[PDB]
Amino acid sequence: KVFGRCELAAAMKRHGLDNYRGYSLGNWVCAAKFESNFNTQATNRNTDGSTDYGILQINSRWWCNDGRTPGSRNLCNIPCSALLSSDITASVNCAKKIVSDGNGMNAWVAWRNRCKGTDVQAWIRGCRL
């Protein structure tokens, strides 16, 4: 499914991402916009042989197992194929573990390139939460 901006903001707030480990809600909505364009089915194969899956493009080399990526660690202990649901539960759970590493949200390249340093609060303004 493709979330509407405000729809994802409300869901993400419901899923506890508003001020999770120092990051305001806007960061997460913005990340989803540029990482998957709000699409829970988004999947992109990478140069290093890994693949990113879901609303938050979780990588198969470190976080989920897709069985075709060399040197995988599967930190979120879950098959990448399970992060493609219209239910964002699984992706949020894993994202929280991801952001809990020292790299913070910098792990999300699109967030780093398109959100960090911008007025992220703009992504939740004008929304009924």
Epitope: G16, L17, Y20, R21, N77, D101, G102
Partner: antibody, heavy 113, light 107 residues
């Protein structure tokens, strides 16, 4: 399946460094985030800190930077170092993964002259 | 740090009856509240993660609800194997903190 187990001295002197080891069986330590939690008398639990798979450490400010958490992949173990201990550090120490699914048996360490 | 307050400190109940334990946070933590059970001579055991998400291997009589600052652990038809301590723990902000615990014992 995964199993954790703490080991180390059960009695230490004030002012010394208290060190504990958590041995992990069932999978590589590089595949998870690892933590240390301790229980004081009176059912008081304190989260000491954790280390991510990439080596990033997070320590509870309550420890006043006297803590160090490290890992040894070849030995599949991770450790806890707590410097300049006092009787206030007597507690039951447990290691567990970040998710809270796997826990050690816990080991009592008493700080006494 | 975030302060977690659990009430009541102790709760006596007769097997078969239902109960609910409270855990309130000094500030909003979204759904980032987890529940642990701890018996004597044993390590804590995760019962519920993220306020209401179930954990495989845990009796289904355990459930959790709440958001923001108020959370609840509910036990449908308490069994004797349930007597012991219950702790809530937040992971919303560093340092992670634990509530003072609620003791469940037979009445």
């Amino acid at each position: 399946d995964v199993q954790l187990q703490e080991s180390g001295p059960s009695l230490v002197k004030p002012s010394q460094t208290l060190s504990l080891t958590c041995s992990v069986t069932g999978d590589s330590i590089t595949s998870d985030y690892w933590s240390w939690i301790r229980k004081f008398p009176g059912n008081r639990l304190e989260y000491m800190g954790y280390v991510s798979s990439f080596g990033s450490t997070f320590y509870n400010p309550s420890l006043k930077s006297r803590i160090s958490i490290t890992r040894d992949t070849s030995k599949n173990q991770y450790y806890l170092d707590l410097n300049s201990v006092t009787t206030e550090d007597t507690a039951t120490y447990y290691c567990a993964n970040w998710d809270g699914d796997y826990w050690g048996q816990g080991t009592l360490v008493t700080v006494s002259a | 740090d975030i302060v977690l307050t659990q009430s009541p400190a102790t709760l006596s109940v007769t097997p078969g009856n239902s109960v609910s334990l409270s855990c309130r946070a000094s500030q909003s933590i979204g759904n980032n509240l987890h529940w642990y059970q701890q018996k004597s001579h044993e390590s804590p055991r995760l019962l519920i993660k993220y306020a209401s998400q179930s954990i495989s291997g845990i009796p289904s009589r355990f459930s959790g609800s709440g958001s923001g600052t108020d959370f609840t652990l509910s036990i449908n038809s308490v069994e004797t194997e349930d007597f012991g301590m219950y702790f809530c723990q937040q992971s919303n902000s560093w340092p992670y903190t634990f509530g003072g615990g609620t003791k469940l014992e037979i009445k």
